[PDB]
Amino acid sequence: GDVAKGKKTFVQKCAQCHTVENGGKHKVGPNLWGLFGRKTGQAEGYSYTDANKSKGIVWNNDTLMEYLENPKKYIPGTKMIFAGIKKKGERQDLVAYLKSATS
Protein backbone atom coordinates (compact mmCIF):
# COMPACT_ATOMS: atom_id res chain seq x y z
CA GLY A 1 0.00 0.00 0.00
CA ASP A 2 0.97 3.66 -0.49
CA VAL A 3 0.01 6.07 2.34
CA ALA A 4 -0.71 9.08 0.10
CA LYS A 5 -3.05 7.15 -2.16
CA GLY A 6 -4.75 5.74 0.94
CA LYS A 7 -5.34 9.27 2.25
CA LYS A 8 -7.04 10.10 -1.03
CA THR A 9 -9.29 7.07 -0.67
CA PHE A 10 -9.98 7.90 2.94
CA VAL A 11 -11.19 11.43 2.15
CA GLN A 12 -13.14 10.30 -0.86
CA LYS A 13 -14.98 7.39 0.79
CA CYS A 14 -14.65 7.52 4.60
CA ALA A 15 -14.08 11.01 5.96
CA GLN A 16 -17.72 12.07 5.86
CA CYS A 17 -18.37 9.48 8.54
CA HIS A 18 -15.09 9.19 10.40
CA THR A 19 -12.18 11.13 11.83
CA VAL A 20 -8.75 9.66 12.48
CA GLU A 21 -7.06 12.19 14.66
CA ASN A 22 -6.35 12.04 18.37
CA GLY A 23 -9.21 13.75 20.09
CA GLY A 24 -11.31 13.76 16.91
CA LYS A 25 -15.10 13.73 17.00
CA HIS A 26 -17.45 10.86 16.36
CA LYS A 27 -18.81 12.26 13.14
CA VAL A 28 -21.26 9.50 12.04
CA GLY A 29 -19.12 6.55 12.90
CA PRO A 30 -16.56 6.45 15.73
CA ASN A 31 -13.25 8.26 15.77
CA LEU A 32 -10.51 5.86 14.65
CA TRP A 33 -7.51 7.02 16.72
CA GLY A 34 -5.84 4.00 18.29
CA LEU A 35 -7.65 1.50 15.95
CA PHE A 36 -4.79 -0.94 15.40
CA GLY A 37 -4.61 -3.50 18.18
CA ARG A 38 -7.99 -2.57 19.56
CA LYS A 39 -10.95 -4.89 20.01
CA THR A 40 -14.20 -3.93 18.29
CA GLY A 41 -16.60 -1.57 19.90
CA GLN A 42 -14.09 0.34 22.00
CA ALA A 43 -14.12 4.06 21.15
CA GLU A 44 -15.19 5.97 24.22
CA GLY A 45 -18.47 7.77 24.00
CA TYR A 46 -19.74 5.97 20.93
CA SER A 47 -22.85 3.75 20.83
CA TYR A 48 -22.06 0.68 18.76
CA THR A 49 -24.32 -2.10 17.56
CA ASP A 50 -24.38 -5.38 19.46
CA ALA A 51 -23.22 -6.91 16.17
CA ASN A 52 -20.04 -4.88 16.21
CA LYS A 53 -19.41 -5.46 19.90
CA SER A 54 -19.91 -9.17 19.57
CA LYS A 55 -17.62 -9.80 16.59
CA GLY A 56 -14.78 -11.06 18.71
CA ILE A 57 -11.87 -9.72 16.66
CA VAL A 58 -8.93 -7.33 17.01
CA TRP A 59 -8.47 -4.64 14.34
CA ASN A 60 -5.21 -5.07 12.43
CA ASN A 61 -4.06 -5.12 8.78
CA ASP A 62 -5.55 -8.53 8.25
CA THR A 63 -9.00 -8.01 9.74
CA LEU A 64 -9.31 -4.53 8.23
CA MET A 65 -8.58 -5.86 4.74
CA GLU A 66 -11.33 -8.39 5.20
CA TYR A 67 -13.85 -6.00 6.76
CA LEU A 68 -13.34 -3.27 4.19
CA GLU A 69 -14.09 -5.58 1.27
CA ASN A 70 -17.63 -6.09 2.48
CA PRO A 71 -18.55 -4.69 5.90
CA LYS A 72 -22.00 -6.28 6.20
CA LYS A 73 -20.74 -9.74 5.40
CA TYR A 74 -18.01 -9.52 8.01
CA ILE A 75 -20.27 -7.95 10.67
CA PRO A 76 -23.94 -8.74 9.94
CA GLY A 77 -26.13 -6.13 11.48
CA THR A 78 -23.54 -3.33 11.61
CA LYS A 79 -24.92 0.20 11.26
CA MET A 80 -22.03 1.16 9.01
CA ILE A 81 -23.65 1.42 5.60
CA PHE A 82 -20.92 1.04 3.05
CA ALA A 83 -20.75 -1.52 0.25
CA GLY A 84 -17.01 -1.96 0.49
CA ILE A 85 -13.77 -1.38 -1.44
CA LYS A 86 -13.65 -4.24 -3.80
CA LYS A 87 -10.18 -3.61 -5.36
CA LYS A 88 -7.45 -5.16 -3.24
CA GLY A 89 -4.85 -2.54 -4.14
CA GLU A 90 -7.04 0.36 -3.09
CA ARG A 91 -7.84 -1.46 0.13
CA GLN A 92 -4.13 -1.95 0.77
CA ASP A 93 -3.43 1.77 0.24
CA LEU A 94 -6.26 2.64 2.64
CA VAL A 95 -5.00 0.30 5.37
CA ALA A 96 -1.47 1.69 4.96
CA TYR A 97 -2.83 5.19 5.50
CA LEU A 98 -4.96 4.18 8.50
CA LYS A 99 -1.94 2.55 10.12
CA SER A 100 0.01 5.71 9.64
CA ALA A 101 -2.66 8.17 10.68
CA THR A 102 -4.15 6.54 13.78
CA SER A 103 -1.10 6.39 16.00
Ligand code: HEC
Ligand atom coordinates in the same frame (compact mmCIF):
# COMPACT_ATOMS: atom_id res chain seq x y z
C1 HEC B 1 -21.03 6.51 7.07
C2 HEC B 1 -22.08 6.25 6.01
C3 HEC B 1 -19.88 5.50 7.09
C4 HEC B 1 -19.01 5.22 6.05
C5 HEC B 1 -19.06 5.77 4.64
C6 HEC B 1 -17.96 4.50 6.58
N1 HEC B 1 -18.26 4.16 7.87
FE1 HEC B 1 -17.06 3.07 9.11
N2 HEC B 1 -18.52 3.12 10.53
C7 HEC B 1 -19.72 3.82 10.46
C8 HEC B 1 -20.49 3.55 11.60
C9 HEC B 1 -21.89 4.09 11.86
C10 HEC B 1 -19.76 2.64 12.37
C11 HEC B 1 -20.24 1.94 13.63
C12 HEC B 1 -20.69 0.53 13.25
C13 HEC B 1 -21.51 -0.24 14.30
O1 HEC B 1 -22.08 -1.34 13.92
O2 HEC B 1 -21.60 0.10 15.48
C14 HEC B 1 -18.53 2.42 11.69
C15 HEC B 1 -17.50 1.60 12.12
C16 HEC B 1 -16.28 1.40 11.49
C17 HEC B 1 -15.22 0.63 12.00
C18 HEC B 1 -15.21 -0.15 13.31
C19 HEC B 1 -14.70 0.75 14.41
C20 HEC B 1 -14.48 0.07 15.76
O3 HEC B 1 -14.99 -1.11 15.93
O4 HEC B 1 -14.21 0.77 16.74
C21 HEC B 1 -14.15 0.78 11.12
C22 HEC B 1 -12.78 0.12 11.22
C23 HEC B 1 -14.59 1.61 10.08
N3 HEC B 1 -15.89 1.96 10.31
C24 HEC B 1 -13.83 1.98 8.98
C25 HEC B 1 -14.28 2.72 7.89
C26 HEC B 1 -13.52 3.09 6.79
C27 HEC B 1 -12.01 2.91 6.65
C28 HEC B 1 -14.40 3.64 5.84
C29 HEC B 1 -14.11 4.09 4.41
C30 HEC B 1 -13.72 2.92 3.51
C31 HEC B 1 -15.65 3.69 6.46
N4 HEC B 1 -15.55 3.18 7.71
C32 HEC B 1 -16.77 4.27 5.92
C33 HEC B 1 -20.14 4.60 9.40
C34 HEC B 1 -19.46 4.74 8.20
